[PDB]
Design a protein around this ligand. Structure first.
Ligand SMILES: *C(=O)Cc1ccc(-c2ccc(-c3ccc(CC(*)=O)cc3)s2)cc1
Ligand SMILES: *C(=O)Cc1ccc(-c2ccc(-c3ccc(CC(*)=O)cc3)s2)cc1
Ligand SMILES: *C(=O)Cc1ccc(-c2ccc(-c3ccc(CC(*)=O)cc3)s2)cc1
Ligand SMILES: *C(=O)Cc1ccc(-c2ccc(-c3ccc(CC(*)=O)cc3)s2)cc1
Ligand SMILES: *C(=O)Cc1ccc(-c2ccc(-c3ccc(CC(*)=O)cc3)s2)cc1
Ligand SMILES: *C(=O)Cc1ccc(-c2ccc(-c3ccc(CC(*)=O)cc3)s2)cc1
Ligand SMILES: *C(=O)Cc1ccc(-c2ccc(-c3ccc(CC(*)=O)cc3)s2)cc1
Ligand SMILES: *C(=O)Cc1ccc(-c2ccc(-c3ccc(CC(*)=O)cc3)s2)cc1
Ligand SMILES: *C(=O)Cc1ccc(-c2ccc(-c3ccc(CC(*)=O)cc3)s2)cc1
Ligand SMILES: *C(=O)Cc1ccc(-c2ccc(-c3ccc(CC(*)=O)cc3)s2)cc1
Ligand SMILES: *C(=O)Cc1ccc(-c2ccc(-c3ccc(CC(*)=O)cc3)s2)cc1
Ligand SMILES: *C(=O)Cc1ccc(-c2ccc(-c3ccc(CC(*)=O)cc3)s2)cc1
Ligand SMILES: *C(=O)Cc1ccc(-c2ccc(-c3ccc(CC(*)=O)cc3)s2)cc1
Ligand SMILES: *C(=O)Cc1ccc(-c2ccc(-c3ccc(CC(*)=O)cc3)s2)cc1
Ligand SMILES: *C(=O)Cc1ccc(-c2ccc(-c3ccc(CC(*)=O)cc3)s2)cc1
Ligand SMILES: *C(=O)Cc1ccc(-c2ccc(-c3ccc(CC(*)=O)cc3)s2)cc1
Ligand SMILES: *C(=O)Cc1ccc(-c2ccc(-c3ccc(CC(*)=O)cc3)s2)cc1
Ligand SMILES: *C(=O)Cc1ccc(-c2ccc(-c3ccc(CC(*)=O)cc3)s2)cc1
Ligand SMILES: *C(=O)Cc1ccc(-c2ccc(-c3ccc(CC(*)=O)cc3)s2)cc1
Ligand SMILES: *C(=O)Cc1ccc(-c2ccc(-c3ccc(CC(*)=O)cc3)s2)cc1
Ligand SMILES: *C(=O)Cc1ccc(-c2ccc(-c3ccc(CC(*)=O)cc3)s2)cc1
Ligand SMILES: *C(=O)Cc1ccc(-c2ccc(-c3ccc(CC(*)=O)cc3)s2)cc1
Ligand SMILES: *C(=O)Cc1ccc(-c2ccc(-c3ccc(CC(*)=O)cc3)s2)cc1
Ligand SMILES: *C(=O)Cc1ccc(-c2ccc(-c3ccc(CC(*)=O)cc3)s2)cc1
Ligand SMILES: *C(=O)Cc1ccc(-c2ccc(-c3ccc(CC(*)=O)cc3)s2)cc1
Ligand SMILES: *C(=O)Cc1ccc(-c2ccc(-c3ccc(CC(*)=O)cc3)s2)cc1
Ligand SMILES: *C(=O)Cc1ccc(-c2ccc(-c3ccc(CC(*)=O)cc3)s2)cc1
Lengths: 5, 5, 5, 5, 5, 5, 5, 5, 5, 5, 5, 5, 5, 5, 5, 5, 5, 5, 5, 5, 5, 5, 5, 5, 5, 5, 5, 5, 5, 5, 5, 5, 5, 5, 5, 5, 5, 5, 5, 5, 5, 5
């Protein structure tokens, strides 16, 4: 539950 | 979750 | 969740 | 959740 | 939730 | 979140 | 959130 | 939130 | 919130 | 998150 | 239920 | 997350 | 339920 | 439930 | 995560 | 999970 | 998991 | 549940 | 796991 | 559940 | 569950 | 017709 | 017709 | 028709 | 038609 | 439809 | 429809 | 659709 | 579809 | 449809 | 589809 | 469809 | 038609 | 599909 | 479809 | 499919 | 049609 | 399909 | 498929 | 059709 | 399909 | 398949 672009 | 399109 | 389109 | 279009 | 169009 | 199309 | 189209 | 079209 | 079109 | 198409 | 842009 | 197409 | 852009 | 871009 | 196509 | 498309 | 497409 | 690009 | 496509 | 690119 | 490129 | 966003 | 995003 | 993103 | 991303 | 995208 | 996008 | 572009 | 581009 | 993408 | 590009 | 991608 | 990514 | 490119 | 990719 | 490229 | 990635 | 890849 | 390249 | 990657 | 790869 | 390359 973590996407940092 | 983390969904990026 | 996190949804980005 | 978080929805971004 | 958070909806942004 | 759910996205239909 | 839900998005239909 | 829900968005229909 | 709901948005119909 | 789920994305349908 | 959080979207900050 | 799940993505259908 | 978190999207920060 | 986290997407930071 | 699962991706269908 | 983390889904990026 | 971590899915990147 | 982690993708950082 | 870690899936990269 | 970790992909860092 | 680890791919770093 | 079409839908944008 | 088409859908964008 | 088509879907983008 | 087609799907992109 | 014809899509010029 | 023809879409010029 | 038919685009005469 | 048919594009006359 | 014809897609010019 | 048929593209006359 | 013809896809020019 | 086709799917990209 | 048929591309006349 | 014909795909020009 | 048939590409006339 | 085809799938890319 | 014909794929030009 | 048939490519006329 | 084909699959790439 | 014919694949030109 | 048949490539006329
Ligand atoms: C009880 O109160 C303690 C406790 C511990 C953990 C949880 C969680 C439920 C779901 C979690 C989670 C969501 C997303 C992500 C990032 C993407 O996968 C990680 C973990 S933690 C609830 C209660
Ligand atoms: C009691 O407090 C223990 C507990 C732990 C976790 C949960 C959850 C229920 C649903 C969860 C969830 C929903 C969506 C997402 C977004 C993408 O995956 C993550 C986690 S955690 C309930 C009770
Ligand atoms: C009691 O307090 C334990 C508990 C823990 C979690 C929950 C949840 C119910 C629904 C949840 C949820 C909904 C949407 C999202 C957005 C994307 O996933 C995340 C989590 S948590 C209820 C009771
Ligand atoms: C009692 O207090 C425990 C508890 C915990 C959570 C809930 C929830 C019910 C609905 C929730 C929710 C709705 C929408 C969103 C937006 C996107 O997901 C998130 C969470 S939490 C009720 C009782
Ligand atoms: C009692 O107090 C425990 C409890 C907890 C949560 C709720 C909720 C009912 C509806 C909720 C909700 C509605 C809309 C949104 C917006 C997007 O999701 C979020 C949460 S919380 C009731 C009782
Ligand atoms: C009882 O009184 C304690 C309690 C705890 C939590 C809740 C909640 C219900 C819904 C919640 C929620 C809505 C939106 C978001 C952001 C987007 O998902 C997060 C949590 S908290 C009610 C009562
Ligand atoms: C009881 O009162 C304690 C408690 C704990 C947690 C909750 C929650 C329900 C839903 C939650 C949630 C919503 C959105 C997000 C971000 C996107 O997924 C995270 C968590 S917390 C309610 C009561
Ligand atoms: C009880 O009150 C303790 C407790 C612990 C955890 C939760 C949660 C439910 C859902 C959670 C969650 C939502 C989104 C994310 C980010 C994306 O996946 C992580 C965790 S925490 C509720 C109550
Ligand atoms: C009690 O607190 C122990 C516990 C631990 C974990 C959970 C979870 C339920 C759902 C989870 C989850 C949902 C979505 C994602 C996003 C991608 O995978 C990650 C994790 S954790 C509940 C209770
Ligand atoms: C109790 O607290 C022990 C425990 C440990 C782990 C879990 C989990 C349930 C679901 C998990 C998970 C979901 C999605 C992903 C994303 C990709 O894989 C990772 C992990 S952990 C529940 C209870
Ligand atoms: C109790 O705390 C011991 C324990 C240990 C591990 C787990 C897990 C459940 C699911 C796991 C997992 C899901 C997805 C991925 C992504 C790719 O593989 C990794 C690990 S760990 C539960 C309880
Ligand atoms: C109990 O509370 C202790 C405990 C220990 C470990 C876990 C985990 C469940 C799933 C985990 C996990 C998810 C993703 C990854 C990266 C990709 O595979 C590694 C581990 S840890 C829960 C509770
Ligand atoms: C109990 O709380 C101690 C404990 C120890 C280990 C775990 C794990 C479950 C899954 C793990 C894992 C996920 C991904 C990777 C990288 C790719 O394979 C390594 C390990 S650790 C949970 C609880
Ligand atoms: C029984 O199947 C009746 C039937 C047949 C075909 C259809 C169609 C719905 C949408 C179609 C379409 C839209 C756009 C394009 C390309 C753009 O011009 C091709 C086809 S055919 C509905 C009911
Ligand atoms: C039985 O299926 C009756 C029937 C057949 C076709 C349709 C259609 C609905 C929408 C159509 C369409 C819209 C746009 C385009 C491209 C733009 O000009 C092609 C087709 S056909 C409805 C009922
Ligand atoms: C029963 O299935 C007979 C039948 C056949 C085809 C259709 C069509 C639906 C949409 C069509 C279309 C619209 C536009 C264009 C070019 C763009 O302007 C091509 C095709 S044909 C309905 C019923
Ligand atoms: C029963 O299946 C008979 C039948 C055959 C074909 C169709 C069609 C649906 C959509 C068609 C189409 C639309 C546009 C174009 C070029 C673009 O403008 C080609 C084909 S044919 C319906 C019923
Ligand atoms: C029985 O199967 C009736 C039938 C046959 C065919 C279809 C179609 C729906 C959509 C079609 C289509 C759209 C676009 C294109 C390329 C763009 O022009 C080709 C075909 S055919 C529906 C019902
Ligand atoms: C029963 O299966 C008979 C049948 C055969 C073929 C079809 C078709 C559906 C879509 C078709 C198509 C649309 C566009 C193009 C070129 C692009 O514009 C080629 C083919 S044919 C339906 C029923
Ligand atoms: C029984 O199978 C009826 C039938 C036959 C064929 C189809 C089709 C649906 C979509 C088709 C298609 C779309 C695009 C293209 C290339 C682009 O023009 C080829 C075929 S055929 C539906 C029902
Ligand atoms: C029963 O299976 C008879 C049958 C045979 C073939 C088809 C077709 C579905 C899609 C077709 C197609 C569309 C476009 C093109 C070139 C591109 O525009 C070639 C083939 S044929 C349906 C039923
Ligand atoms: C029984 O099998 C009826 C039938 C036969 C064939 C099909 C097809 C669905 C999609 C097809 C297709 C699409 C694209 C291409 C290349 C691009 O033009 C070739 C074939 S045939 C459906 C039902
Ligand atoms: C029963 O199996 C009879 C039959 C035979 C062949 C087919 C076909 C499905 C798709 C076909 C196709 C589409 C496009 C092209 C060239 C590209 O445009 C070649 C073949 S034939 C369906 C039923
Ligand atoms: C019984 O098997 C009916 C049948 C026969 C053949 C098919 C096909 C589905 C897709 C096909 C195809 C697509 C593309 C290409 C190359 C590109 O043009 C060749 C074949 S044939 C479905 C049902
Ligand atoms: C029963 O098995 C009879 C039969 C035989 C062959 C087929 C075919 C499926 C796909 C075919 C094909 C499509 C395209 C091309 C050239 C490219 O455009 C060659 C072959 S034939 C279906 C049923
Ligand atoms: C019984 O077996 C019916 C049958 C026969 C053949 C097929 C086929 C599915 C896909 C085929 C194919 C696609 C591409 C190519 C080369 C490109 O043009 C050759 C064959 S044949 C399905 C059902
Ligand atoms: C029963 O087995 C009869 C039969 C025989 C052969 C086939 C075929 C499936 C795919 C074929 C094919 C497609 C394309 C090409 C050249 C490329 O475009 C050659 C062969 S034949 C199905 C059923």
């Amino acid at each position: 539950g973590a996407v940092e672009v």
